[PDB]
Design a protein around this ligand. Structure first.
Ligand code: ATP
Ligand code: ATP
Lengths: 529, 528
C-alpha cells in the first residue's frame, strides 16, 4: 500500500504522470476551452531495478481511492497465445471491449518488447498478425475513449517503429540509475519507522560510499544489516530445532554492522560486465592524490561542465601520456572516471569489441556512439591507444574517424584516452586529433620526496613498532626513502609488499631486535633495476 | 463523427481522383452506359507512418453515410476473420461478401491488409495460403460481383502477393508522402480554427518553416502540449495539492515563448529510430555562410533546373575545398535541408557497414532502385576521397554500373563532397565530372564583413547585461588578428570568449572581466 511516498528523487516524472491521467478527470474545463484532448500514452525504458514497476503500482494504488474511481488492467508479457489459430488476436479484442465498457480505465502492457517486435518477412506469421491487430486497435477507424496505455521495456530500439508515434506512444521517459543525491532520500524512506533513527550525517556518510547501487540494492542492504545484529546477539539459535523466546529490546542496529554487509555484497550493475570505474585503494591514495587533483583541475579548464544559461564548450578532448610503468593507464584514469560521477560512461577497448561473437565490431562502435549522443553529456573511455591503433582493420578506423566527426560541434561529449609512447612518437593519424597548442595534453611526473616519505610513513614506525596481540628505524626510513628515489610505481608497491611479508612473519615474537636486522638485510638484499 | 472532407488538408489530387469512383457512377449514371465503362473499383493506400491515411476513410464514410444517396459501409480489422474451426476461417469472408452484395451499393474496408494476405510461400502453414487463394478467386471470378469497392491500407507495399495487384482486383495505388511547406500551413489552419484569440496568419507562416519533418499527429500533439505549457506557466502551484482549486479562465492566453519551449521539448516522429542527413544552420554559426549557401543554390539552379516541363541531362555536382574550410560538415547538410520535398537517400561508411546481416551490394542496389522509383530524388556520397579507398573492387564495379542504366533525362541528382583538389583525385572519378560543363564548385573563406557580424552581437550587446569605448577597440583588435583563420578556429575562439562572460556572471561591476578578456586575446594563439 504505497501512495506516492516510497518514491525517491523522481519529481518531474511524477508531475508529468499526474498531469497525464488525473487532470482530465479533475479539471474538464480548460481542455474543452481549446479542444486539447491531452495525450493518452507513455513508454518507460532503462536499466533494470530503477523503479520501473513501483511507479505504476503506486499510481494504481493511489488512484483507486476515489472519487474519482479509476479501474485497472494488468497483463503479463505474452498471455495472449494459444494453440488454435483464432484466439490470440481475440483476447486483445475482448480485453479492449471490457476496458472500454468500464471507462475510464488504465491498461498496462508489461514488457511489450516480448510482444511486438520489428516486423519482418523471415519469422513466423503469428507475430506479424498479432502486431498488426495491436497496431489497428490503438488507432483505428473508431476512436477509443478514456483509456490510457502504459508500457515498459529494457531495449527501446527493439520496438516496432510504427508503434512510436503521436497517438499510441507519444512520450518517452528515461529511467536512469540514481545519482549521489537521491540515495539519501531512498535511505530515509527505507529506514523511516525505526525507533533509534540513524542521524542524517550517518545516512549521508553511507551515501557517498555507495556507487552503482540501483534502487533494489539499497533495500537489500538495509535488510542484510539488521540480520547481522541478530546473528551477533543470539548465536545459539541455529543449534536447536524448536521454538524459542527472545528479548527484542537490545538488538539495536549499529554502524559496524553496515561495513560487513557492504564488503559482502556487490551491486547489480557490476554483476555481468565490469564497471570501468574504481577509486584508488587506501594504500595508493597518499601517493597519487595530488596528481589526480591536478588532472581534474586541468579537465575543469578544458571541460567546463565539470564545475561540480548553460556553459558552452567546443569538442572536449583530453589525452594522458607518460613513460611506461608510471601507472597512468592502470591507476589514474579509473580514479578520474570514478570522481566524475553522474555521467554515463561507455567503454571501447579490445576485450569489448572482440568480446562478442555475433556482431561486427563496427556495429558495436556505431551503437556505442549513438547511445553516447542520445544521453549527452557523457564520457567515451578508450585506454591504451598506442596498442589499440594497430590491431583492427582499416574499415573500423575509417568508421570511428567519421562517426566522431558527425557529432554536433557544441555537444558536450568527452573523448578520454591514454598512451605510453610519447606524443611525437605516435602515428600521425592520432596526432591530428590532439591540439596541444589548445591545451589538450597532460604530462605525468614522478612524485616528490615528501609524498614518498608519507607513503612509507605509516609502516615505519607504527606497524613495525606495534605490540603483538625506537630510533634506528628512523635511519632505516631515511635509507629506504633515499634508495627508492628513482623507482616507478610498480617497483614502489613491490617493495612495500616484501617488507610487510617479514612483518607478518613475526606474529608471536614479543622481543624486538630479532627482525630489525632482518629488515635492514632485506631492504639491501632487494635490488631492482 | 463530424468530419466531412474539410478537416483534411494538403491532399487535393487524391481526394479529387477518389470521389469519381464512388459518387460519379451514381450521380451521373447516364454517361457510362454510352461508353459501357464500368469504372475501376479498387484502391490501395500506402506510405510512411503517420501521414494521415485512416482520416480519409473516416471522412469518406461520414460524408457518404449522410446524404441523398445512401450507401452501406462495412469495416474490418487486420485478421479478425480467422476462427479455430476449419470450416469457419474462410466462410466469414463469404458471408460478408454475400451481405455486401445483398445491400449494394456498399463499401468494404480492410485495415492493415499486410496482416491478412501475405505472399504465397511453401515454408509456412496452409491456412494463410487458403485464405489468400479464396480471396483472390472470390473478388473477381466467374460471378462478376458487380458494384463492390474494396479499399486497403498498409505500410509495407512490397509484402503483397503480386497476384492481388493487377487490374480487376486492386486497380489504382496512391502514394501518401510527408506534407511539404504549404500543406503544413494548411493543417495548422485546420487544427486551430476554433480559438477565440485567433492567431495571425503571418505567425503561422513563420512557424511552418521551423517544423521540418513533422507530419500530422506531430502537429496535433504540439498544438496540445502548447496549451499544457501555458497552463504550467500560469498556475505553477497546482501539483502540490490533492484538492481542486479555483481557476480563472481569463489569463490563459498563448504566447510565442510557449511554442518555443514546446518545440524544443519535442522531436519529430520520422527521424526517431534513425537520423536524417539534413540539418539547418545553428543560430550561432548562421551569420557566416548564407552567401555561400545562396551561391551554391544558384549553381544548382544553373545545373539542376527543378529548383512544358524543364529539361535536364544527368545533373551532378561536387563541392571541393581545403581541409578545415567546412564543406563536409556544415555546407552539404544545409543544402540538403534547404531542398526539401525531395526524398533523400544517404550513402556513406556508417550506413554501408553499420548494419550487419546483409551485403553492401544489396544495400546500394536497393537504395538506387528506390531512388529511381521516387524520382526526383537526391543521392548523397560524402567524403568521396576516403570513401573511394575503403571499399572492394566488386562494390566499385557495381556502383559504377548502376548509375549508367538510369534514364538519361530522369531528374536523379548525385551529390558528393571532396577535400583534396580535383587534380589529385584518382582516375575513374575525374571522368565522372566534366567541369567544362560547370559541374565543379570551389569554396573560399568568408571576408571581413561577415566576420565582424559574427562577433558584434556577442561583444556589443550580450557583453553588457543588466544582471564602453574600449569595446570597439577590443572588437577591432579581434577582427584584425583573426583575418586568416578557418571555421574551426573561429568557433573555438568564440567559445573561449564566451567562457569568460559565463564565468563573470555574478559580478555587479565591470572592468574586472575586460582585462581577463584581454589576456585571453593575446595569450591565445592558433596553430594555422
Ligand atoms: N525510489 C524507490 N523507492 C523504493 N524502492 C525502489 C525505488 N526504485 C526502485 N525500487 C525497487 O524496485 C522495485 C520496483 O521496481 P522493480 O525494480 O521491481 O522494476 P524493474 O526491475 O526496474 O523493472 P523490470 O523488473 O521489469 O526489469 C521495488 O521492489 C523497490 O524495492
Ligand atoms: N492532413 C491532415 N489533416 C488533418 N489531420 C491529419 C492530417 N494528417 C494527419 N492528421 C492526423 O494524424 C492522425 C493520423 O491517423 P491515421 O490512423 O489516419 O494515420 P495512419 O498513418 O493511418 O496511422 P498508423 O500509421 O498509425 O496506422 C489523424 O488522427 C489526424 O488527426
Amino acid at each position: 500500500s504505497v501512495r506516492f511516498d516510497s518514491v525517491g528523487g523522481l519529481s518531474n516524472h511524477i508531475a508529468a504522470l499526474k498531469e497525464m491521467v488525473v487532470f482530465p478527470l479533475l479539471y474538464p474545463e480548460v481542455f474543452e476551452k481549446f479542444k486539447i484532448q491531452p495525450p493518452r500514452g507513455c513508454l518507460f525504458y532503462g536499466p533494470p531495478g530503477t523503479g520501473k514497476t513501483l511507479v505504476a503500482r503506486a499510481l494504481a494504488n493511489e488512484c483507486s481511492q476515489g472519487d474519482k474511481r479509476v479501474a485497472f488492467f494488468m497483463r503479463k508479457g505474452a498471455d495472449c497465445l494459444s494453440k488454435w489459430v483464432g484466439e490470440s488476436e481475440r483476447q486483445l479484442r475482448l480485453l479492449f471491449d471490457q476496458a472500454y465498457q468500464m471507462r475510464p480505465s488504465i491498461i498496462f502492457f508489461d514488457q511489450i518488447d516480448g510482444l511486438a517486435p520489428v516486423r519482418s518477412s523471415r519469422q513466423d506469421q503469428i507475430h506479424s498478425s498479432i502486431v498488426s491487430t495491436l497496431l489497428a486497435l490503438m488507432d483505428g477507424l473508431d476512436s477509443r475513449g478514456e483509456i490510457v496505455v502504459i508500457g515498459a521495456t529494457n531495449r527501446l530500439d527493439s520496438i516496432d517503429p510504427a508503434l512510436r508515434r503521436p497517438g499510441r506512444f507519444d512520450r518517452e521517459f528515461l529511467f536512469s540509475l540514481p545519482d549521489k543525491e537521491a540515495r539519501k532520500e531512498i535511505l530515509k524512506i527505507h529506514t523511516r519507522d525505526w525507533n533509534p533513527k540513524p542521524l542524517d550525517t550517518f545516512l549521508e556518510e553511507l551515501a557517498e560510499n555507495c556507487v552503482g547501487y540501483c534502487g533494489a540494492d539499497i533495500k537489500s542492504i538495509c535488510a542484510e544489516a539488521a540480520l547481522c545484529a541478530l546473528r551477533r546477539r543470539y548465536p545459539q539459535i541455529y543449534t536447536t530445532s524448536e521454538k524459542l523466546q527472545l528479548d527484542l529490546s537490545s538488538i539495536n542496529i549499529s554502524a559496524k554492522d553496515f561495513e560487513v554487509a557492504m564488503q559482502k555484497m556487490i551491486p547489480a550493475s557490476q554483476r555481468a560486465v565490469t564497471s570501468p570505474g574504481q577509486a584508488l585503494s587506501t594504500v595508493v591514495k597518499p601517493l597519487l592524490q595530488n596528481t589526480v587533483d591536478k588532472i581534474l583541475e586541468a579537465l575543469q579548464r578544458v571541460f567546463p561542465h565539470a564545475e561540480f544559461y548553460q556553459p558552452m564548450s567546443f569538442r572536449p578532448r583530453i589525452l594522458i601520456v607518460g613513460e611506461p610503468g608510471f601507472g597512468q593507464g592502470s591507476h589514474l584514469a579509473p580514479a578520474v572516471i570514478h570522481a566524475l560521477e553522474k555521467f554515463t560512461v561507455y567503454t571501447l577497448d579490445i576485450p569489448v569489441l572482440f568480446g562478442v561473437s555475433t556482431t561486427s565490431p563496427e556495429e558495436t562502435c556505431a551503437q556505442v556512439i549513438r547511445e553516447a549522443k542520445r544521453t549527452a553529456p557523457s564520457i567515451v573511455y578508450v585506454p591504451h591507444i598506442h596498442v589499440w591503433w594497430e590491431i583492427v582493420g582499416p574499415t573500423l578506423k575509417a568508421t570511428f574517424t567519421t562517426l566522431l566527426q558527425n557529432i554536433p560541434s557544441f555537444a558536450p561529449v568527452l573523448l578520454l584516452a591514454t598512451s605510453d609512447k610519447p606524443h611525437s612518437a605516435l602515428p600521425e593519424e592520432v596526432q591530428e586529433l590532439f591540439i596541444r597548442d589548445y591545451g589538450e595534453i597532460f604530462n605525468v611526473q614522478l612524485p616528490d620526496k615528501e609524498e614518498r616519505t608519507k607513503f612509507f610513513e605509516d609502516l615505519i614506525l607504527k606497524q613495525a613498532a606495534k605490540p603483538p596481540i625506537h630510533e634506528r628505524l628512523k635511519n632505516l626510513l631515511k635509507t629506504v626513502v633515499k634508495k627508492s628515489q628513482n623507482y616507478n610505481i610498480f617497483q614502489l608497491e613491490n617493495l612495500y609488499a616484501v617488507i610487510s611479508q617479514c612483518i607478518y612473519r613475526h606474529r608471536k615474537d614479543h622481543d624486538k631486535t630479532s627482525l630489525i636486522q632482518k629488515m635492514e638485510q632485506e631492504v639491501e638484499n632487494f635490488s631492482c633495476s
